[PDB]
PDB file of C-alpha atoms and ligand atoms in Angstrom:
ATOM      1  CA  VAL A   1     -11.608  22.188   4.566  1.00 45.69           C
ATOM      2  CA  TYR A   2     -11.914  18.307   4.890  1.00 45.40           C
ATOM      3  CA  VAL A   3     -14.986  17.269   6.996  1.00 47.94           C
ATOM      4  CA  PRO A   4     -14.509  13.831   8.666  1.00 46.92           C
ATOM      5  CA  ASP A   5     -17.300  11.338   7.816  1.00 50.79           C
ATOM      6  CA  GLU A   6     -18.340   7.640   7.454  1.00 49.37           C
ATOM      7  CA  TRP A   7     -14.894   6.992   5.832  1.00 47.54           C
ATOM      8  CA  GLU A   8     -12.879   8.333   8.847  1.00 47.58           C
ATOM      9  CA  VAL A   9     -11.172   5.440  10.793  1.00 51.51           C
ATOM     10  CA  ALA A  10      -9.566   5.581  14.308  1.00 54.03           C
ATOM     11  CA  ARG A  11      -5.705   5.674  14.002  1.00 56.31           C
ATOM     12  CA  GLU A  12      -5.765   3.037  16.836  1.00 54.80           C
ATOM     13  CA  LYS A  13      -7.292   0.410  14.404  1.00 57.17           C
ATOM     14  CA  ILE A  14      -4.456   0.865  11.774  1.00 55.36           C
ATOM     15  CA  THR A  15      -1.052  -0.992  11.894  1.00 54.05           C
ATOM     16  CA  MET A  16       1.814  -0.250   9.398  1.00 54.27           C
ATOM     17  CA  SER A  17       3.946  -3.466   8.837  1.00 56.83           C
ATOM     18  CA  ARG A  18       6.583  -2.484   6.161  1.00 54.12           C
ATOM     19  CA  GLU A  19       7.389   0.027   3.330  1.00 56.81           C
ATOM     20  CA  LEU A  20       6.095  -0.964  -0.180  1.00 56.24           C
ATOM     21  CA  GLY A  21       7.694   2.107  -1.862  1.00 56.36           C
ATOM     22  CA  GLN A  22       6.886   5.748  -2.753  1.00 56.29           C
ATOM     23  CA  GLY A  23       3.517   6.624  -4.362  1.00 55.81           C
ATOM     24  CA  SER A  24       1.866   9.940  -5.306  1.00 54.08           C
ATOM     25  CA  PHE A  25       1.889  11.895  -2.019  1.00 55.79           C
ATOM     26  CA  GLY A  26       4.318   9.814   0.097  1.00 59.45           C
ATOM     27  CA  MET A  27       5.375   6.331   1.271  1.00 60.17           C
ATOM     28  CA  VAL A  28       2.868   3.441   0.846  1.00 57.66           C
ATOM     29  CA  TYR A  29       3.028   0.793   3.657  1.00 58.91           C
ATOM     30  CA  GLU A  30       1.650  -2.765   3.877  1.00 58.75           C
ATOM     31  CA  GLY A  31      -0.421  -3.098   7.088  1.00 61.15           C
ATOM     32  CA  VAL A  32      -3.642  -4.158   8.841  1.00 60.42           C
ATOM     33  CA  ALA A  33      -6.889  -2.260   9.672  1.00 59.75           C
ATOM     34  CA  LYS A  34      -9.616  -3.431  12.134  1.00 62.38           C
ATOM     35  CA  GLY A  35     -13.235  -3.389  10.805  1.00 59.39           C
ATOM     36  CA  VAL A  36     -12.766  -1.437   7.516  1.00 57.74           C
ATOM     37  CA  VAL A  37     -14.295  -4.428   5.602  1.00 60.81           C
ATOM     38  CA  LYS A  38     -17.693  -6.048   6.473  1.00 61.49           C
ATOM     39  CA  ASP A  39     -17.477  -9.755   7.591  1.00 64.22           C
ATOM     40  CA  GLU A  40     -13.676  -9.309   8.192  1.00 66.44           C
ATOM     41  CA  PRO A  41     -12.555  -8.246  11.699  1.00 64.29           C
ATOM     42  CA  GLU A  42      -8.968  -7.497  10.470  1.00 64.19           C
ATOM     43  CA  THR A  43      -8.010  -6.667   6.791  1.00 62.69           C
ATOM     44  CA  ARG A  44      -4.567  -6.600   5.061  1.00 62.38           C
ATOM     45  CA  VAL A  45      -4.404  -3.027   3.584  1.00 62.47           C
ATOM     46  CA  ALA A  46      -2.110  -0.615   1.716  1.00 63.65           C
ATOM     47  CA  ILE A  47      -1.644   2.677   3.669  1.00 62.27           C
ATOM     48  CA  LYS A  48      -0.381   5.845   1.908  1.00 61.39           C
ATOM     49  CA  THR A  49       0.995   8.540   4.295  1.00 61.62           C
ATOM     50  CA  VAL A  50       1.532  12.240   3.512  1.00 64.14           C
ATOM     51  CA  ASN A  51       5.213  12.876   4.482  1.00 64.24           C
ATOM     52  CA  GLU A  52       6.068  15.545   7.159  1.00 65.84           C
ATOM     53  CA  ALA A  53       7.580  17.695   4.288  1.00 66.05           C
ATOM     54  CA  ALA A  54       3.897  18.410   3.339  1.00 66.34           C
ATOM     55  CA  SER A  55       2.390  21.962   3.282  1.00 67.03           C
ATOM     56  CA  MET A  56      -1.199  22.189   4.736  1.00 64.29           C
ATOM     57  CA  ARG A  57      -2.049  23.037   1.041  1.00 66.81           C
ATOM     58  CA  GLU A  58      -0.701  19.559  -0.014  1.00 69.36           C
ATOM     59  CA  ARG A  59      -2.140  17.663   3.051  1.00 69.21           C
ATOM     60  CA  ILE A  60      -5.613  18.983   1.965  1.00 68.29           C
ATOM     61  CA  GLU A  61      -4.971  18.156  -1.761  1.00 69.81           C
ATOM     62  CA  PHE A  62      -4.136  14.549  -0.628  1.00 71.47           C
ATOM     63  CA  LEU A  63      -7.497  14.115   1.229  1.00 71.22           C
ATOM     64  CA  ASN A  64      -9.668  15.755  -1.521  1.00 68.59           C
ATOM     65  CA  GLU A  65      -8.024  13.599  -4.271  1.00 72.43           C
ATOM     66  CA  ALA A  66      -8.556  10.482  -2.058  1.00 74.68           C
ATOM     67  CA  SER A  67     -12.192  11.628  -1.450  1.00 74.50           C
ATOM     68  CA  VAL A  68     -12.889  11.263  -5.230  1.00 76.67           C
ATOM     69  CA  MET A  69     -12.390   7.475  -4.695  1.00 76.17           C
ATOM     70  CA  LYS A  70     -15.266   7.445  -2.101  1.00 76.22           C
ATOM     71  CA  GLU A  71     -17.718   7.613  -5.085  1.00 76.23           C
ATOM     72  CA  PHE A  72     -15.965   4.627  -6.825  1.00 72.96           C
ATOM     73  CA  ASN A  73     -17.244   1.021  -6.517  1.00 75.59           C
ATOM     74  CA  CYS A  74     -15.621  -1.027  -9.369  1.00 76.03           C
ATOM     75  CA  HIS A  75     -13.889  -4.470  -9.389  1.00 77.21           C
ATOM     76  CA  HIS A  76     -11.169  -3.137 -11.774  1.00 76.86           C
ATOM     77  CA  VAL A  77     -10.349   0.109  -9.789  1.00 76.16           C
ATOM     78  CA  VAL A  78      -8.280  -0.124  -6.518  1.00 73.72           C
ATOM     79  CA  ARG A  79     -10.742   0.585  -3.646  1.00 72.83           C
ATOM     80  CA  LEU A  80     -10.466   3.221  -0.878  1.00 73.78           C
ATOM     81  CA  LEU A  81     -11.232   1.523   2.517  1.00 74.51           C
ATOM     82  CA  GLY A  82     -10.796   4.532   4.894  1.00 75.67           C
ATOM     83  CA  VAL A  83      -9.181   7.886   5.778  1.00 73.63           C
ATOM     84  CA  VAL A  84      -7.309   9.140   8.904  1.00 76.80           C
ATOM     85  CA  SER A  85      -7.827  12.946   8.613  1.00 81.60           C
ATOM     86  CA  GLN A  86      -7.001  13.881  12.266  1.00 78.32           C
ATOM     87  CA  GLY A  87      -3.413  14.061  13.598  1.00 77.42           C
ATOM     88  CA  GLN A  88      -0.215  13.255  11.633  1.00 75.01           C
ATOM     89  CA  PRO A  89       0.692  11.458   9.581  1.00 75.97           C
ATOM     90  CA  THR A  90      -2.552  11.818   7.517  1.00 72.39           C
ATOM     91  CA  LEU A  91      -3.421   8.242   6.272  1.00 70.96           C
ATOM     92  CA  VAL A  92      -5.341   6.923   3.229  1.00 72.16           C
ATOM     93  CA  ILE A  93      -6.030   3.154   3.655  1.00 71.19           C
ATOM     94  CA  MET A  94      -6.943   1.080   0.543  1.00 69.99           C
ATOM     95  CA  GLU A  95      -7.265  -2.424  -0.996  1.00 71.14           C
ATOM     96  CA  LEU A  96      -3.799  -4.108  -0.806  1.00 72.15           C
ATOM     97  CA  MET A  97      -2.639  -5.257  -4.283  1.00 72.18           C
ATOM     98  CA  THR A  98      -0.378  -8.151  -3.256  1.00 73.85           C
ATOM     99  CA  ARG A  99       1.509  -8.602  -6.611  1.00 70.85           C
ATOM    100  CA  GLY A 100       2.452  -4.863  -6.852  1.00 68.52           C
ATOM    101  CA  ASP A 101       2.379  -2.666 -10.005  1.00 68.88           C
ATOM    102  CA  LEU A 102       1.843  -4.208 -13.495  1.00 68.28           C
ATOM    103  CA  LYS A 103       5.238  -2.784 -14.716  1.00 66.60           C
ATOM    104  CA  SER A 104       7.258  -4.681 -12.021  1.00 64.04           C
ATOM    105  CA  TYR A 105       5.041  -7.774 -12.579  1.00 63.75           C
ATOM    106  CA  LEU A 106       5.599  -7.656 -16.396  1.00 59.11           C
ATOM    107  CA  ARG A 107       9.389  -7.113 -15.849  1.00 59.14           C
ATOM    108  CA  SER A 108       9.452 -10.268 -13.617  1.00 60.14           C
ATOM    109  CA  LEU A 109       8.064 -12.421 -16.564  1.00 60.42           C
ATOM    110  CA  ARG A 110      11.236 -11.667 -18.681  1.00 60.64           C
ATOM    111  CA  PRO A 111      13.239 -14.837 -19.580  1.00 61.74           C
ATOM    112  CA  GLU A 112      12.588 -16.673 -16.276  1.00 63.29           C
ATOM    113  CA  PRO A 113       5.973 -14.588 -21.007  1.00 62.85           C
ATOM    114  CA  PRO A 114       2.137 -14.144 -21.187  1.00 61.45           C
ATOM    115  CA  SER A 115      -0.183 -15.900 -23.757  1.00 62.65           C
ATOM    116  CA  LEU A 116      -2.417 -13.866 -26.165  1.00 63.77           C
ATOM    117  CA  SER A 117      -5.491 -14.807 -24.035  1.00 67.62           C
ATOM    118  CA  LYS A 118      -3.726 -13.735 -20.768  1.00 68.77           C
ATOM    119  CA  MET A 119      -2.802 -10.314 -22.372  1.00 67.40           C
ATOM    120  CA  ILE A 120      -6.368  -9.745 -23.736  1.00 69.42           C
ATOM    121  CA  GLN A 121      -7.494 -10.432 -20.110  1.00 70.31           C
ATOM    122  CA  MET A 122      -5.253  -7.630 -18.670  1.00 71.64           C
ATOM    123  CA  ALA A 123      -6.277  -5.256 -21.539  1.00 70.31           C
ATOM    124  CA  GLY A 124     -10.035  -5.810 -20.860  1.00 74.68           C
ATOM    125  CA  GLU A 125      -9.742  -5.438 -17.047  1.00 74.37           C
ATOM    126  CA  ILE A 126      -7.757  -2.130 -17.506  1.00 78.20           C
ATOM    127  CA  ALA A 127     -10.190  -0.977 -20.247  1.00 78.90           C
ATOM    128  CA  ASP A 128     -13.167  -1.863 -17.949  1.00 81.56           C
ATOM    129  CA  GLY A 129     -11.812   0.124 -14.954  1.00 79.58           C
ATOM    130  CA  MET A 130     -11.090   3.068 -17.310  1.00 79.41           C
ATOM    131  CA  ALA A 131     -14.639   2.805 -18.828  1.00 79.96           C
ATOM    132  CA  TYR A 132     -15.992   2.892 -15.203  1.00 79.19           C
ATOM    133  CA  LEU A 133     -13.935   6.048 -14.381  1.00 81.01           C
ATOM    134  CA  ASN A 134     -14.965   7.850 -17.649  1.00 83.11           C
ATOM    135  CA  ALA A 135     -18.621   6.932 -16.885  1.00 83.85           C
ATOM    136  CA  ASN A 136     -18.178   8.714 -13.459  1.00 84.97           C
ATOM    137  CA  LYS A 137     -16.775  11.826 -15.308  1.00 83.33           C
ATOM    138  CA  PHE A 138     -13.129  11.121 -14.161  1.00 84.61           C
ATOM    139  CA  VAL A 139      -9.989  11.490 -16.344  1.00 84.40           C
ATOM    140  CA  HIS A 140      -7.009   9.528 -14.880  1.00 83.96           C
ATOM    141  CA  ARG A 141      -4.174  11.498 -16.669  1.00 84.19           C
ATOM    142  CA  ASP A 142      -1.446   8.970 -15.628  1.00 78.06           C
ATOM    143  CA  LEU A 143      -2.597   5.574 -16.999  1.00 77.82           C
ATOM    144  CA  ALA A 144       0.570   3.429 -17.414  1.00 78.38           C
ATOM    145  CA  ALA A 145       1.733  -0.094 -16.383  1.00 79.36           C
ATOM    146  CA  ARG A 146       3.407   1.500 -13.287  1.00 80.81           C
ATOM    147  CA  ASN A 147      -0.051   2.804 -12.067  1.00 79.41           C
ATOM    148  CA  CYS A 148      -1.960  -0.438 -12.831  1.00 81.32           C
ATOM    149  CA  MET A 149      -1.917  -2.869  -9.853  1.00 83.07           C
ATOM    150  CA  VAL A 150      -2.056  -6.734  -9.835  1.00 81.76           C
ATOM    151  CA  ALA A 151      -4.195  -8.552  -7.163  1.00 82.69           C
ATOM    152  CA  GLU A 152      -3.479 -12.013  -5.556  1.00 85.37           C
ATOM    153  CA  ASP A 153      -5.662 -13.661  -8.309  1.00 87.05           C
ATOM    154  CA  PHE A 154      -3.833 -11.706 -11.157  1.00 84.77           C
ATOM    155  CA  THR A 155      -6.791  -9.254 -11.685  1.00 84.61           C
ATOM    156  CA  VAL A 156      -5.345  -5.933 -12.991  1.00 82.98           C
ATOM    157  CA  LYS A 157      -6.870  -2.691 -11.609  1.00 85.11           C
ATOM    158  CA  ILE A 158      -6.497   1.078 -12.203  1.00 86.02           C
ATOM    159  CA  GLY A 159      -4.216   2.582  -9.495  1.00 85.86           C
ATOM    160  CA  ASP A 160      -2.422   5.849  -8.554  1.00 85.39           C
ATOM    161  CA  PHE A 161      -3.444   9.048 -10.463  1.00 83.98           C
ATOM    162  CA  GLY A 162      -2.096  11.489  -7.806  1.00 82.08           C
ATOM    163  CA  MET A 163       1.337  11.683  -9.480  1.00 78.94           C
ATOM    164  CA  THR A 164       0.258  14.192 -12.247  1.00 76.69           C
ATOM    165  CA  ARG A 165      -2.198  16.368 -10.231  1.00 72.70           C
ATOM    166  CA  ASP A 166      -0.973  19.910  -9.353  1.00 69.41           C
ATOM    167  CA  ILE A 167      -2.250  21.658  -6.137  1.00 70.40           C
ATOM    168  CA  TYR A 168      -3.439  24.812  -8.020  1.00 69.80           C
ATOM    169  CA  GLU A 169      -4.488  23.919 -11.682  1.00 70.84           C
ATOM    170  CA  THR A 170      -8.071  24.936 -12.866  1.00 73.84           C
ATOM    171  CA  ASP A 171      -8.266  28.262 -10.900  1.00 76.02           C
ATOM    172  CA  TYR A 172      -4.513  29.178 -11.300  1.00 75.68           C
ATOM    173  CA  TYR A 173      -1.594  28.244 -13.662  1.00 75.28           C
ATOM    174  CA  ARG A 174       2.204  28.164 -12.778  1.00 74.28           C
ATOM    175  CA  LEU A 175       5.159  16.550 -13.666  1.00 73.38           C
ATOM    176  CA  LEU A 176       4.245  15.016 -17.112  1.00 72.22           C
ATOM    177  CA  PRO A 177       4.447  11.399 -18.329  1.00 72.08           C
ATOM    178  CA  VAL A 178       5.538  12.394 -21.914  1.00 71.94           C
ATOM    179  CA  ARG A 179       5.911   8.742 -23.065  1.00 71.95           C
ATOM    180  CA  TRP A 180       2.228   8.019 -22.135  1.00 69.40           C
ATOM    181  CA  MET A 181       0.812  11.433 -23.300  1.00 68.13           C
ATOM    182  CA  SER A 182      -1.327  12.118 -26.412  1.00 66.31           C
ATOM    183  CA  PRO A 183      -0.298  14.880 -28.855  1.00 65.35           C
ATOM    184  CA  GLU A 184      -3.058  17.270 -27.594  1.00 64.61           C
ATOM    185  CA  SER A 185      -1.824  16.554 -23.986  1.00 63.73           C
ATOM    186  CA  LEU A 186       1.788  17.425 -25.047  1.00 60.40           C
ATOM    187  CA  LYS A 187       0.763  20.511 -27.143  1.00 57.59           C
ATOM    188  CA  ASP A 188      -1.960  22.169 -24.974  1.00 55.12           C
ATOM    189  CA  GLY A 189      -2.114  20.211 -21.656  1.00 55.21           C
ATOM    190  CA  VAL A 190      -5.573  18.866 -22.700  1.00 53.53           C
ATOM    191  CA  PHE A 191      -6.522  15.707 -20.724  1.00 53.07           C
ATOM    192  CA  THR A 192      -9.803  13.958 -21.716  1.00 50.43           C
ATOM    193  CA  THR A 193     -11.137  10.358 -21.788  1.00 52.41           C
ATOM    194  CA  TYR A 194      -9.668  10.338 -25.356  1.00 50.41           C
ATOM    195  CA  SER A 195      -6.161  11.218 -23.977  1.00 47.79           C
ATOM    196  CA  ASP A 196      -6.620   8.324 -21.431  1.00 49.92           C
ATOM    197  CA  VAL A 197      -7.317   6.020 -24.472  1.00 51.56           C
ATOM    198  CA  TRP A 198      -3.924   7.113 -25.990  1.00 56.70           C
ATOM    199  CA  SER A 199      -2.217   6.100 -22.697  1.00 58.01           C
ATOM    200  CA  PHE A 200      -4.156   2.768 -22.816  1.00 56.96           C
ATOM    201  CA  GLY A 201      -2.551   2.035 -26.227  1.00 59.54           C
ATOM    202  CA  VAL A 202       0.887   2.646 -24.621  1.00 60.52           C
ATOM    203  CA  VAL A 203      -0.016   0.193 -21.762  1.00 65.04           C
ATOM    204  CA  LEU A 204      -0.928  -2.506 -24.369  1.00 65.96           C
ATOM    205  CA  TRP A 205       2.549  -1.856 -25.911  1.00 62.53           C
ATOM    206  CA  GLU A 206       4.093  -2.179 -22.386  1.00 61.98           C
ATOM    207  CA  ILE A 207       2.180  -5.518 -21.942  1.00 59.89           C
ATOM    208  CA  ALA A 208       3.428  -6.831 -25.362  1.00 60.70           C
ATOM    209  CA  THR A 209       7.098  -5.754 -24.678  1.00 61.39           C
ATOM    210  CA  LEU A 210       7.022  -6.927 -20.998  1.00 63.29           C
ATOM    211  CA  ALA A 211       7.490  -3.246 -19.972  1.00 61.97           C
ATOM    212  CA  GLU A 212      10.245  -1.866 -22.229  1.00 63.84           C
ATOM    213  CA  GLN A 213      10.491   1.944 -21.756  1.00 60.34           C
ATOM    214  CA  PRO A 214       8.336   3.358 -24.584  1.00 60.16           C
ATOM    215  CA  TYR A 215      10.476   5.357 -27.100  1.00 64.21           C
ATOM    216  CA  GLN A 216      13.735   4.012 -25.449  1.00 62.02           C
ATOM    217  CA  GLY A 217      16.810   5.890 -26.779  1.00 59.81           C
ATOM    218  CA  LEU A 218      14.742   9.096 -27.203  1.00 57.44           C
ATOM    219  CA  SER A 219      15.109  11.687 -24.360  1.00 58.91           C
ATOM    220  CA  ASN A 220      11.855  13.135 -22.842  1.00 57.39           C
ATOM    221  CA  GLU A 221      12.332  16.369 -24.977  1.00 55.16           C
ATOM    222  CA  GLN A 222      12.796  14.199 -28.129  1.00 57.37           C
ATOM    223  CA  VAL A 223       9.604  12.162 -27.359  1.00 58.48           C
ATOM    224  CA  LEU A 224       7.632  15.444 -27.000  1.00 57.24           C
ATOM    225  CA  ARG A 225       8.759  16.565 -30.553  1.00 58.73           C
ATOM    226  CA  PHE A 226       8.467  13.016 -32.063  1.00 57.92           C
ATOM    227  CA  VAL A 227       4.853  12.288 -30.860  1.00 56.13           C
ATOM    228  CA  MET A 228       3.559  15.858 -31.579  1.00 54.20           C
ATOM    229  CA  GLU A 229       4.939  15.435 -35.165  1.00 50.64           C
ATOM    230  CA  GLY A 230       2.932  12.166 -35.623  1.00 50.70           C
ATOM    231  CA  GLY A 231       5.593   9.698 -34.355  1.00 49.40           C
ATOM    232  CA  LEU A 232       4.338   6.252 -33.211  1.00 50.02           C
ATOM    233  CA  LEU A 233       5.804   3.250 -31.307  1.00 44.50           C
ATOM    234  CA  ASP A 234       7.083   0.395 -33.553  1.00 43.29           C
ATOM    235  CA  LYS A 235       4.915  -2.803 -33.372  1.00 43.87           C
ATOM    236  CA  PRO A 236       6.740  -5.007 -30.794  1.00 44.55           C
ATOM    237  CA  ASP A 237       8.555  -8.204 -32.006  1.00 42.20           C
ATOM    238  CA  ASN A 238       5.985 -11.075 -32.347  1.00 42.45           C
ATOM    239  CA  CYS A 239       3.120  -8.801 -31.107  1.00 42.44           C
ATOM    240  CA  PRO A 240      -0.310 -10.353 -31.906  1.00 40.53           C
ATOM    241  CA  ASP A 241      -2.067  -8.454 -34.791  1.00 41.32           C
ATOM    242  CA  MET A 242      -5.224  -8.376 -32.560  1.00 43.46           C
ATOM    243  CA  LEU A 243      -3.341  -6.089 -30.082  1.00 44.61           C
ATOM    244  CA  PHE A 244      -1.284  -3.888 -32.488  1.00 45.20           C
ATOM    245  CA  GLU A 245      -4.594  -3.162 -34.355  1.00 43.84           C
ATOM    246  CA  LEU A 246      -5.883  -1.855 -30.967  1.00 41.85           C
ATOM    247  CA  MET A 247      -2.716   0.290 -30.374  1.00 43.73           C
ATOM    248  CA  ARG A 248      -3.138   1.891 -33.870  1.00 47.34           C
ATOM    249  CA  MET A 249      -6.800   2.774 -33.056  1.00 44.04           C
ATOM    250  CA  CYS A 250      -5.719   4.338 -29.689  1.00 43.79           C
ATOM    251  CA  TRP A 251      -2.840   6.352 -31.321  1.00 45.51           C
ATOM    252  CA  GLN A 252      -5.066   8.217 -33.841  1.00 44.73           C
ATOM    253  CA  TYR A 253      -3.470  11.725 -33.821  1.00 46.06           C
ATOM    254  CA  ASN A 254      -7.024  13.246 -33.765  1.00 47.29           C
ATOM    255  CA  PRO A 255      -8.881  12.379 -30.513  1.00 47.52           C
ATOM    256  CA  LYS A 256     -12.318  12.234 -32.299  1.00 46.65           C
ATOM    257  CA  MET A 257     -11.024   9.222 -34.336  1.00 49.13           C
ATOM    258  CA  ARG A 258     -10.000   7.226 -31.177  1.00 46.98           C
ATOM    259  CA  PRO A 259     -12.294   4.494 -29.784  1.00 50.28           C
ATOM    260  CA  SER A 260     -14.045   4.867 -26.378  1.00 47.42           C
ATOM    261  CA  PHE A 261     -13.078   2.340 -23.633  1.00 47.76           C
ATOM    262  CA  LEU A 262     -16.529   0.671 -24.168  1.00 46.53           C
ATOM    263  CA  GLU A 263     -15.727   0.288 -27.966  1.00 48.46           C
ATOM    264  CA  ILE A 264     -12.315  -1.224 -26.989  1.00 45.86           C
ATOM    265  CA  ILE A 265     -14.088  -3.785 -24.676  1.00 49.13           C
ATOM    266  CA  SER A 266     -16.754  -4.640 -27.385  1.00 47.91           C
ATOM    267  CA  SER A 267     -13.832  -5.431 -29.788  1.00 47.97           C
ATOM    268  CA  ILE A 268     -12.312  -8.029 -27.304  1.00 50.84           C
ATOM    269  CA  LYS A 269     -15.339  -9.186 -25.149  1.00 51.52           C
ATOM    270  CA  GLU A 270     -15.402 -12.476 -27.198  1.00 51.55           C
ATOM    271  CA  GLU A 271     -11.824 -13.347 -26.040  1.00 50.71           C
ATOM    272  CA  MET A 272     -12.463 -12.248 -22.354  1.00 53.25           C
ATOM    273  CA  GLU A 273     -12.770 -15.010 -19.664  1.00 51.66           C
ATOM    274  CA  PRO A 274     -16.237 -16.157 -18.476  1.00 56.28           C
ATOM    275  CA  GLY A 275     -15.956 -14.515 -14.993  1.00 59.12           C
ATOM    276  CA  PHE A 276     -15.572 -10.998 -16.578  1.00 59.60           C
ATOM    277  CA  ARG A 277     -19.421 -10.969 -17.161  1.00 61.68           C
ATOM    278  CA  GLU A 278     -20.202 -10.988 -13.369  1.00 59.36           C
ATOM    279  CA  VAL A 279     -17.377  -8.589 -12.098  1.00 59.14           C
ATOM    280  CA  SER A 280     -17.133  -6.063 -15.055  1.00 60.91           C
ATOM    281  CA  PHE A 281     -18.639  -2.532 -15.339  1.00 62.09           C
ATOM    282  CA  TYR A 282     -19.121  -3.217 -19.107  1.00 60.63           C
ATOM    283  CA  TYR A 283     -21.871  -5.829 -18.364  1.00 61.15           C
ATOM    284  CA  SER A 284     -23.079  -4.110 -15.097  1.00 59.94           C
ATOM    285  CA  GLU A 285     -26.622  -2.541 -14.927  1.00 61.09           C
ATOM    286  CA  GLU A 286     -24.767   0.807 -14.256  1.00 60.56           C
ATOM    287  CA  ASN A 287     -23.558   0.936 -17.942  1.00 57.32           C
ATOM    288  CA  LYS A 288     -25.722   3.531 -19.823  1.00 55.95           C
TER     289      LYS A 288
HETATM  290  C1  IER B 301      -7.399   4.185  -8.760  1.00 56.61           C
HETATM  291  C2  IER B 301      -6.682   5.116  -7.789  1.00 56.61           C
HETATM  292  O1  IER B 301      -5.926   4.190  -6.997  1.00 56.61           O
HETATM  293  C3  IER B 301      -5.054   4.773  -6.142  1.00 56.61           C
HETATM  294  C4  IER B 301      -5.171   6.114  -5.774  1.00 56.61           C
HETATM  295  C5  IER B 301      -4.230   6.594  -4.874  1.00 56.61           C
HETATM  296  C6  IER B 301      -4.283   7.917  -4.451  1.00 56.61           C
HETATM  297  C7  IER B 301      -4.424   8.961  -5.363  1.00 56.61           C
HETATM  298  C8  IER B 301      -4.446  10.282  -4.901  1.00 56.61           C
HETATM  299  C9  IER B 301      -4.341  10.585  -3.544  1.00 56.61           C
HETATM  300  C10 IER B 301      -4.208   9.536  -2.644  1.00 56.61           C
HETATM  301  C11 IER B 301      -4.182   8.207  -3.084  1.00 56.61           C
HETATM  302  N1  IER B 301      -3.248   5.799  -4.390  1.00 56.61           N
HETATM  303  C12 IER B 301      -3.119   4.519  -4.745  1.00 56.61           C
HETATM  304  C13 IER B 301      -2.081   3.711  -4.233  1.00 56.61           C
HETATM  305  F1  IER B 301      -1.188   4.185  -3.397  1.00 56.61           F
HETATM  306  C14 IER B 301      -1.935   2.373  -4.510  1.00 56.61           C
HETATM  307  C15 IER B 301      -0.852   1.563  -4.103  1.00 56.61           C
HETATM  308  N2  IER B 301       0.407   1.923  -4.317  1.00 56.61           N
HETATM  309  C16 IER B 301       1.271   0.974  -3.990  1.00 56.61           C
HETATM  310  C17 IER B 301       2.809   1.082  -4.073  1.00 56.61           C
HETATM  311  C18 IER B 301       3.297   2.376  -4.800  1.00 56.61           C
HETATM  312  C19 IER B 301       4.362   1.474  -5.471  1.00 56.61           C
HETATM  313  C20 IER B 301       5.706   1.433  -4.749  1.00 56.61           C
HETATM  314  O2  IER B 301       4.598   1.787  -6.823  1.00 56.61           O
HETATM  315  C21 IER B 301       3.446   0.238  -5.216  1.00 56.61           C
HETATM  316  N3  IER B 301       0.578  -0.091  -3.546  1.00 56.61           N
HETATM  317  C22 IER B 301       0.954  -1.332  -3.083  1.00 56.61           C
HETATM  318  C23 IER B 301      -0.067  -2.219  -2.692  1.00 56.61           C
HETATM  319  N4  IER B 301      -1.356  -1.928  -2.772  1.00 56.61           N
HETATM  320  C24 IER B 301      -1.765  -0.730  -3.244  1.00 56.61           C
HETATM  321  N5  IER B 301      -3.081  -0.471  -3.295  1.00 56.61           N
HETATM  322  C25 IER B 301      -0.803   0.238  -3.642  1.00 56.61           C
HETATM  323  C26 IER B 301      -2.860   1.891  -5.446  1.00 56.61           C
HETATM  324  C27 IER B 301      -3.912   2.676  -5.967  1.00 56.61           C
HETATM  325  C28 IER B 301      -4.041   4.000  -5.619  1.00 56.61           C
END
């Protein structure tokens, strides 16, 4: 039973320019919202709509999942700006990421690549956002280049998690990214910070291959068998040892033996850009 609040915005103030493509619950539009940002009368925003093929059960799921993001304030996690809970379509307005998803972006760099220092940068930003989320007791469950977003200034941020969330799970039992999923996720549907770290390893591999499909030539059923039986992605051609060392740490079959996101950041903080100190969660007062 969603209760409107602070975050509720008048539908009047919102303007939907053009389609950006399908996200978790429905179409995401580019647009403009009046007075959703302080010291900014009008703001360029992304607007996700729940389609009209949406059960009340799903329209409520949409708002509650969005509402999780109300508690989030992190430079490396895409920000919620406001909610339109009354009337249809139900809107969730958020920070517009003007260079789209990291997968598309990485695909665009293919024989027109990124330097080692530019890849470490992406890794640390993603790791920092994920460290922030795990600090706020949140497991993403769908970390992947396609759900990392790129800002105007090339900052990478943690994006859509909706895609994997069922309406019923927790209380009752009845969509899985097998190529990004840890063995314990594939075997038992266990999703923890440590499973998110596995996915993070796969995103490094995506970054180093400019978004090849992980385990290409294996079907989804084959990947499920292969990874559960200790299968691993081959080190990409001319992948820096720095990075492949990180992938190996993330792909420890046993979750206990995987590094935390903080440990990952510690291991690369030397090679991070100077700015990262001011914007990051890692260096923030909020970090433990
Ligand atoms: C950390 C959690 O972050 C999120 C949670 C959510 C979200 C999760 C559950 C319920 C409701 C919303 N939804 C997000 C989102 F829709 C976007 C988003 N998607 C796209 C489209 C889709 C495409 C076609 O792949 C590119 N965008 C284009 C431009 N700017 C965007 N911000 C953006 C980004 C981040 C999101």
